[PDB]
Amino acid sequence: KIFKPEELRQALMPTLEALYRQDPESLPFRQPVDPQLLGIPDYFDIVKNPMDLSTIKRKLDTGQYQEPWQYVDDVWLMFNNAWLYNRKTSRVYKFCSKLAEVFEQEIDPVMQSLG
Ligand SMILES: C[C@@H]1CC(=O)Nc2cccc(-c3ccc4c(c3)c(C3CC3)nn4C)c2N1
Ligand SMILES: [Ca+2]
């Protein structure tokens, strides 16, 4: 199948919106990580490919995905970065886990529909 960018945006954006909507848990994930501002200067050493909700939104808005699994992969890159960088006690780690719970419910029917 050839997926048009407007079709991917229309189908997938609600699943991203579900993550944005989560408070407090989306807060760490709404903007790209700025290691200087956050006082975590080793972040890019450990996290080779940073990813966040706003970057994913921008990719949908600008037609950067050819396939819907590329979108799923970026969401999971964001999750895996957070579980990699943070210890299990951190808010960021626990908030990530909550987003993954929400996402799994949202994404399932949408991916089935897209095929
Ligand atoms: C995802 C990003 C990078 C990472 O993996 N660890 C990390 C460490 C310190 C603060 C943060 C961090 C970044 C932005 C935040 C926050 C934490 C938070 C606090 C509510 C949890 N609010 N916002 C706007 C952080 N999160
Ligand atoms: Ca809530």
Side-chain angles (χ1 to χ4, degrees):
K1 195 181 169 76
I2 308 168
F3 295 93
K4 298 175 182 84
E6 66 273 18
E7 297 163 340
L8 294 176
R9 180 173 174 271
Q10 183 184 34
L12 296 168
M13 194 65 78
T15 73
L16 196 68
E17 291 168 348
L19 304 188
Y20 268 99
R21 273 202 308 274
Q22 299 310 305
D23 196 288
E25 301 93 341
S26 73
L27 287 168
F29 304 103
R30 289 175 173 190
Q31 58 286 310
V33 176
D34 182 333
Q36 178 195 52
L37 175 61
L38 293 174
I40 51 177
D42 66 348
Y43 184 82
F44 299 151
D45 293 337
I46 290 167
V47 176
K48 301 308 186 180
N49 297 292
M51 188 51 56
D52 79 299
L53 297 171
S54 72
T55 298
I56 299 171
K57 184 180 186 294
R58 182 74 173 201
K59 288 190 184 189
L60 290 170
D61 287 341
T62 64
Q64 299 296 299
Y65 299 125
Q66 300 84 51
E67 313 289 342
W69 292 95
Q70 291 169 320
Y71 164 81
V72 178
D73 286 346
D74 270 340
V75 174
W76 274 82
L77 174 59
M78 179 185 79
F79 296 157
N80 276 131
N81 289 341
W83 292 316
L84 170 64
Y85 186 73
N86 303 283
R87 294 188 70 89
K88 288 181 291 162
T89 49
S90 57
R91 291 171 294 168
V92 175
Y93 192 107
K94 292 177 173 299
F95 287 181
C96 178
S97 292
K98 164 71 172 176
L99 296 193
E101 181 191 88
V102 170
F103 189 65
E104 155 192 283
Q105 186 156 59
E106 278 272 323
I107 196 58
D108 181 352
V110 173
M111 293 298 288
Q112 284 221 246
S113 82
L114 286 167

